[PDB]
Amino acid sequence: KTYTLTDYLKNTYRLKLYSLRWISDHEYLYKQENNILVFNAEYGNSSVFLENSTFDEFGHSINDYSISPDGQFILLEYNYVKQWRHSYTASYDIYDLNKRQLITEERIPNNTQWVTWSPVGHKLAYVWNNDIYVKIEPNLPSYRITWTGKEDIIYNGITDWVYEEEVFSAYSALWWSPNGTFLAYAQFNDTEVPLIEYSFYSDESLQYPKTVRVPYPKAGAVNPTVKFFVVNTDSLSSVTNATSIQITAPASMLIGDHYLCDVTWATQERISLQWLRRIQNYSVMDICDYDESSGRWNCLVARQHIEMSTTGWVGRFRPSEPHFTLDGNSFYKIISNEEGYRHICYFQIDKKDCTFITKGTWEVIGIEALTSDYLYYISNEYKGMPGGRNLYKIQLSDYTKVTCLSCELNPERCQYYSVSFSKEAKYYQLRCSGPGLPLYTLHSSVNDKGLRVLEDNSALDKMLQNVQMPSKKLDFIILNETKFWYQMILPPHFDKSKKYPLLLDVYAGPCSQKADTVFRLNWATYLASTENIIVASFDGRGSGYQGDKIMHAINRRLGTFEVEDQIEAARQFSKMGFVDNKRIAIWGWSYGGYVTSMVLGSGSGVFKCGIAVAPVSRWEYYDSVYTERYMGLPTPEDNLDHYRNSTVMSRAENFKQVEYLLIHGTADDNVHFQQSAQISKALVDVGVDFQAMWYTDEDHGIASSTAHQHIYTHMSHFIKQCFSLP
Amino acid sequence: SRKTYTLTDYLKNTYRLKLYSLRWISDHEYLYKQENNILVFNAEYGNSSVFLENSTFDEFGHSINDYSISPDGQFILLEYNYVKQWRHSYTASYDIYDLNKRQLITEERIPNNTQWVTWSPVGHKLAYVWNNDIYVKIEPNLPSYRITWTGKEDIIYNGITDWVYEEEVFSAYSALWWSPNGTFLAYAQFNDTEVPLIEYSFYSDESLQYPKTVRVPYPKAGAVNPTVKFFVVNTDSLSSVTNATSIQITAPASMLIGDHYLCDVTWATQERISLQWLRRIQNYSVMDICDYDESSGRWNCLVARQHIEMSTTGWVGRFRPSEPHFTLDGNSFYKIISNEEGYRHICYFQIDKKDCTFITKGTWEVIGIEALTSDYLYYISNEYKGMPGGRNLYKIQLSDYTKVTCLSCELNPERCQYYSVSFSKEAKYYQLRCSGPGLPLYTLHSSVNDKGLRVLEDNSALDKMLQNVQMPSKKLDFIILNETKFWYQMILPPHFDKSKKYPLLLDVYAGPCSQKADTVFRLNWATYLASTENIIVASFDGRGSGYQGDKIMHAINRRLGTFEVEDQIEAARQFSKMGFVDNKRIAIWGWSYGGYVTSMVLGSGSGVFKCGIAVAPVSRWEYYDSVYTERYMGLPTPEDNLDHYRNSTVMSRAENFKQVEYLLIHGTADDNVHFQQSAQISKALVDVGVDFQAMWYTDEDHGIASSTAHQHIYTHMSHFIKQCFSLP
Ligand SMILES: *[C@H](N)[C@@H]1CCCN1C(=O)[C@@H](N)Cc1ccc(-c2ccccc2)cc1
Ligand SMILES: *[C@H](N)[C@@H]1CCCN1C(=O)[C@H](N)Cc1ccc(-c2ccccc2)cc1
């Protein structure tokens, strides 16, 4: 048989994972059914750290727990109420693991926006009603740390909309120091930030549609401001209002609009912060130390570091994070070479110049672990494949010595990895995503020897061997010297003679990679396996993990090359002899929906049909942080001219020659529905027919169970009909 | 080869229908635009003259979209900067032009952004509303008079209606009534302080970075309705520095007892004015004849003169209580009221006397009173040939009811069975307007000997053009159901061979007192579908439809979403029963109430229809405005009609769509039928796992009538229809 839409939708073929949480450097927690066993990394044996029963009766559905470092409590999260992409509120309850008695006194508020323990011990810090509260003991009263919170105005401890989504990629906005002595946080002011407003219809019972209003800054609009503070969580009394010490500047940032882009504690008395100018090609890092007697925090200018650019923005999406040495005196952090390839550089806190410890036409995806003799990192060097992933270790005393921890384990099924070390990189869990089926192994850092296999996904392999699964070809093509990768999901019993319809799956956003060695079971799977349709992807100009030459090829010019190279890919794929020139479609979501629109509106006759889901249409309608970063400001003095040059509706006319399907959630807080409405309006004015579909109350993810299922069913029909498939 | 009526012909309106819109400025003359310059006409002899010349307001710097002559012909109201709001309400700029001195007035100019403005029934006075306030200008060059100081956006309206009174009760933005004399200016005052607001986005032009949220005082079923007060001021006692005194006319005590509405205002004399009030439960209504009193300058309304109008079978009136037409002295008036047998006829009232006398009866209804003279009473009815879907002009002698005469029945039978009329100030002359079933014909006449003066337009140009195009024919007939006959019409293709099996599209509306079956001549989408796609387009008037008596119309009282839906599926059933229908290709479509019905029918799971299109429909009545919905469904409270309110939602029938192709369409800026309505339909469908086709229209309202939107939406439905009928 074959992999169908129902399989995809009904998740008939699930991939097993092995989610574990190190609680120490020798132990880790792992959910075994309705039990939270605790394993021993060495002998790998376990024991029920907590029985499913324990938390029995309690008229509330519990979703995800959180054991304190002390292991003396396990805050229980329930009543989860999804907000933005990371934010959400829930009710909480602590439970003493030794008194088996659920806390009752001072219990954490309801509608909590975020909680978290101290890195060690059982200190609890939480945000409520936009204010910070601190608990030294689960059963003892909380201490107000802030008194300025104000729903969607003043945010203390939690990011505002754009900061969570495009900056800290998190809701949380507070960082505990190593031993829980200091509690740091940022403060966001949205007062002058405009609000995007949309209707939310809700349950049929609702008589009047509701209006959601979110402080959301669009390109060139008034941005939110920020303040950083640090409060000593030991000087707090039942009387004094914990005095928070602020950390301002740098003056090079205060000269105007800027953002806080990173918080990284170096030591128990030293914290690092990176600042980014609205024009994101200049970043400043400050390393501040606690001044014993004085109580304030000082950031020696001798210790600040400038990370600027002249061919684009800074970082892959933001100035990378620092990974400090144990004594917080120096650090390492990915930065761009003089050659354009991001590599690990070594800094001395008060030494302006760093030394690249890695180099070459490949790049470091990130720094995973740091010990006194080794720096563990992931890169895409191996086989010279930007789309592959591996764990590497480099000797700090000799950069010439760099061993690849994963590369050879099973070169067959594992060319993409992820790592997870213990409390002191004594052991680490290797996580293979593919090209084969997920494989999780446990190793020892002192020898890197494989302790055992935690999960081989044999159960799946079994089932999958009875399904006409599709195949996957990951290779490249060349354009003007440089080579650009791409991947094709091929139908079962592929035949290079027979011509197949081709569906171009695209995202093509700045620093993206739709071509990798990861094993995925999705809609493309069904299309290929059941509709014998080739689903391809191509990472052209603007894509990441190949040096700035590629990734910055679209600086201040979104909707140019990424769009062009996209057309070229299909343009050549056809010239491959197994593609039906007359049956080539293109589809994408978000940025991918934009490029998909720009392309179907290019008029290259190359495509027959295309689908754009939750697409951007005019960069001025998208948030600042993300947009300006590639486009600058929509001012005539800056880039307003190109901003206006890249709109989807400017190419409405050219839609007459293609078959278009536009879809969009009405509650999209990210890429506003307004975008897609502005598009349809353009097609109506020009006289271009096309199909549409809006999804009531769904956001950017159009992920609700029924919503998700419906859109894939619809898009199917669209595609199968466009390709004349039974 | 011979062509057909294509989509492009209807969209690009290639075959145009000549009109002839007069504008009686007197009982002897009328204004007519020479499509470049308006001129004056003499009804008597037919000779004309260039009243206002195109080459006059040039270099104006702006364009005029509507002129407006004064009652004394001494001034001409110029209108520019027009900006549409709702169905009738709009705003614009104005200028006064002296026709007696050919000079645009430059003093005390009418404000910019004016909401409404009308002359005086006589002379040349002016009453305009700016910023929700009423102002008066005795002379154009002179300053105005602030009649009100309570005006305020979305809260207090003085002289203009708020969204619901505009669309549902009055069907006009205006809320001021001059006294036939001109000395009196009566006006209404609406209060929406607590009326919930319907909010929705308006994206505006691409350059709008952040979408704008439109907030509107709109009461949904059972919500907090607006309140209202009445006033009458003396435009003679104005001339001052002091504030205008505004007398108020309250009660009736039978109306103040609870929520209610002001539904009609008609002056009777210079010192008499009649007001008709409606209760929130629109089945009871009072008529208050109020007489002026010079003694106290106040207005009184002797309860001894009220006329109650209630209905135990439904609501009062077709859509609201009918208007009264008063006699000379104003002690008597004629009006439409359904008689004890259920039909609407003309009843004679003498105020002081009880009950009224019907001067008309029969198994047909009086559509409307057009003119009242001391001599006769002219009206429109569907008496002729017992065709409910026919319309003719009659005249009944007031001194002997047996002397009824049809003024339009025989004029041109085979060609005209549907007429509308337009009289002069005292109806010395009138223009009949034959809009069916043949080519639109326009005729002018004299009341005296009812002579046929002449022809103003007989579309002989279109007629010639339609002689090289395969036009479809129209079949108007009926069928019996439950021993009753219900009419239906079909747009049959060219050479309609009863042998073949044609695909049929059921065009529906079926709203309360609606009528989709008539003798009217039309050139629309159906024309194209039948002519080019050879599709049979039919409509059917079932229970709840109008112009056939209350037994039928009130059939759906307190039961919207029942019989009218049923009778629809049935009609279809009965059509494929005639043999020239392909059971495999039966579709259905409707706009507004038509979408609702089209949705409910596709949701009844009868499987009779393959596909269906629903344009901006209603999904559940609690979503519609009170005035309308309530008049049929009552109150949505457990204590009244809530249950059925919950039973008639399209949403609850989602699962049954699994067996159909549905095309859902709505303008995102609809203020009438909130987009929210289709937003819920689409959501319930998605939750039951039903695939369907949707299409939203950015910034379009209930009409989806822009030039680009109109063509786009129709092109689209034509694609869906054909697709559904498997035909090129
Ligand atoms: C489509 N997916 C759209 C196209 C415009 C950008 N899109 C988004 O949805 C971005 N907000 C996606 C995004 C969000 C966050 C990060 C990020 C990266 C690194 C650190 C923190 C956050 C990247 C991309
Ligand atoms: C669709 N066409 C929808 C159907 C629900 C009501 N809709 C409207 O557009 C209007 N609210 C209908 C309407 C009908 C008739 C009148 C009217 C008022 C006064 C006298 C006669 C008719 C007003 C509004």
Q: Name the one residue in this structure whose structure tokens are 């969607």.
A: A152
CB contact under 8 A, A692 and B694: yes
DSSP string, A12-55: -SPPP---EEESSSSEEEEEETTEEEEEETTT--EEESS-TTTS
Residue of the nearest CA to atom 6 in ligand 1? A591
Residue of the nearest CA to atom 11 in ligand 1? A166
- B722's enclosing H/E stretch is helix B707-724
Architecture of domain B17-459: 8 Propeller (2.140)
Using the Cα atoms of residue B604, residue B609, residue B612 and residue B614 in order, give the sign of their dihedral. negative
Ligand 2 binding pocket includes B511 (Cβ within 6 Å): yes
Which pair of structure tokens corresponds to residue A323? 């990974």
Strand-pair partners of A102:
A95
CA–CA dist A419, A378 (Å, integer): 8
Looking at residue B321, the DSSP 8-state letter turns out to be P
Q: Which of B564, B689, B551 is nearest to B618 (CA)?
A: B564
Q: Could you tell me the strand order of the sheet in which A74-82 lies?
A: A62-67, A74-82, A88-93
Backbone phi, psi, residue A633, to 5°? -100, 140
**Contact (Cβ atoms closer than 8 angstroms) between residue A321 and residue A301:** no
**Contact (Cβ atoms closer than 8 angstroms) between residue A184 and residue A271:** yes
Which residue of A199, A219, A707 is in closest CB contact with B199? A199
Residue of B nearest to A220 (CA): B209
- A74's enclosing H/E stretch is strand A74-82
End-to-end CA distance of chain A: 17
Q: How far is the CA of A565 from the centre of ligand 1 (A)?
A: 21
Question: Which residues of B fall within a CB distance of 8 Å from A619?
Answer: none
- B261's enclosing H/E stretch is strand B260-267
Q: Name the one residue in this structure whose structure tokens are 């996957």.
A: A472
Task: Say how many C-beta atoms besides its own lie within 10 A of residue A45's C-beta.
Answer: 8
Residue of the nearest CA to atom 24 in ligand 2? B168
CB contact under 8 A, B203 and A677: yes
Question: Which residues of A fall within a CB distance of 8 Å from B655?
Answer: none
Ligand 2 binding pocket includes B628 (Cβ within 6 Å): yes
Cα dihedral A9, A13, A18, A19 in deg (nearest 10): 10
Question: b/e string for B601-624 if b means 16 or more Cβ within 10 A?
Answer: bbbbebebbbbbbbbbbbbbbbbb
CATH 2.140.10.30 fits A15-457, yes or no: yes
Q: What is the set of active-site residues of B?
A: 592, 670, 702
Residue of A nearest to B218 (CA): A208
Ligand 1 binding pocket includes A532 (Cβ within 6 Å): no
Question: Which residues of B fall within a CB distance of 8 Å from A666?
Answer: 679
CA–CA dist A632, A277 (Å, integer): 11
Strand-pair partners of A335:
A343
Ligand 2 binding pocket includes B672 (Cβ within 6 Å): yes
**Contact (Cβ atoms closer than 8 angstroms) between residue A709 and residue A493:** no
Q: Can you tell me whether residue A598 is helix, strand or coil?
A: helix
CA–CA dist B656, B195 (Å, integer): 36
What angle, 0 to 180 degrees and rounded to 10, lies between the N-to-C axes of helices B563-576 and B593-602?
70
Query: What CA–CA distances, in Å, run from A115 to A55, A122, A133, B486?
Result: 20, 12, 9, 69
Q: Which of A123, A58, A118 is nearest to A91 (CA)?
A: A58
The number of C-alpha atoms within 13 Å of B519 and in the hemisphere containing its C-beta is 25
CB contact under 8 A, A707 and B686: yes
Question: Which residues of B fall within a CB distance of 8 Å from A211?
Answer: 199, 213
CA–CA dist A701, B227 (Å, integer): 45
CA–CA dist B576, B569 (Å, integer): 11
Q: Which of B267, B344, B331 is nearest to B305 (CA)?
A: B331
Task: Please state whether beta strands B75-84 and A114-117 pair in parallel, antiparallel, or not at all (unpaired).
Answer: unpaired
Query: What CA–CA distances, in Å, run from B66 to B125, B162, B323, B367?
Result: 19, 23, 28, 30
At residue A375, what is the residue type?
A: L
Task: Say how many C-beta atoms besides its own lie within 10 A of residue A656's C-beta.
Answer: 14
- A8's enclosing H/E stretch is helix A5-10
Which of B168, B276, B556 has most ligand 2 atoms within 8 Å of CB, for mutation? B168
**Contact (Cβ atoms closer than 8 angstroms) between residue A149 and residue A155:** yes
Q: Where in chain A is the domain with CATH 2.140.10.30?
A: 15-457
Size of chain B in residues? 728
Q: How many CB pairs under 8 A join A and B?
A: 121
CA–CA dist A715, A660 (Å, integer): 11
Q: Can you tell me whether residue B675 is helix, strand or coil?
A: coil
At residue A32, what is the residue type?
A: Q
Chain A: closest CA distance from residue B155 (Å): 19
Backbone phi, psi, residue B214, to 5°? -90, 120
Query: Which CATH number does A1-11+466-726 carry?
Result: 3.40.50.1820
Experimental method: X-ray
Residue B139: partners with Cβ closer than 8 Å, 6 or more residues away: B124
Which residue of B210, B622, B689 is in closest CB contact with A218? B210
* Homologous superfamily (CATH) for B1-13+468-728: Alpha/Beta hydrolase fold, catalytic domain (3.40.50.1820)
Ligand 2 binding pocket includes B561 (Cβ within 6 Å): no
Max CA separation in chain A (angstroms): 82
Strand-pair partners of B184:
B234
Cis peptide leading into residue B140 (ω within 30°): no
Q: Where in chain A is the domain with CATH 3.40.50.1820?
A: 1-11+466-726
The 3-class secondary structure across B526-540, one letter per residue, is HHHHHHCCCCEEEEE
Which residue of B213, B680, B719 is in closest CB contact with A689? B719
**Contact (Cβ atoms closer than 8 angstroms) between residue A545 and residue A515:** no
Query: What CA–CA distances, in Å, run from B576 to B408, B568, B569, B662?
Result: 36, 13, 11, 21
Chain A: closest CA distance from residue B716 (Å): 7
Q: Can you tell me whether residue B194 is helix, strand or coil?
A: coil
Task: Please state whether beta strands A398-404 and A414-421 pair in parallel, antiparallel, or not at all (unpaired).
Answer: unpaired
Question: Which residues of A fall within a CB distance of 8 Å from B194?
Answer: none
Whether A668 is catalytic is: yes
Q: Where in chain B is the domain with CATH 2.140.10.30?
A: 17-459
**Contact (Cβ atoms closer than 8 angstroms) between residue A341 and residue A360:** yes
CA–CA dist B475, A333 (Å, integer): 83
CA–CA dist A574, B387 (Å, integer): 66
Mutation target among B698, B701, B716 for the A interface, most CBs of A within 10 A: B698
CA–CA dist B119, A186 (Å, integer): 65
Which residue of A201, A694, A713 is in closest CB contact with B691? A713
CB contact under 8 A, A204 and B668: no
Which residue of B203, B676, B686 is in closest CB contact with A201? B676
Chain A: closest CA distance from residue B706 (Å): 10
Set A548, A668, A669, A699: catalytic member: A668
CB contact under 8 A, A695 and B682: yes
The number of C-alpha atoms within 13 Å of A239 and in the hemisphere containing its C-beta is 0
Residue A2: partners with Cβ closer than 8 Å, 6 or more residues away: A467, A468, A492, A529, A530
Helix ranges (H only) for A121-250 are 161-162
- B443's enclosing H/E stretch is strand B441-446
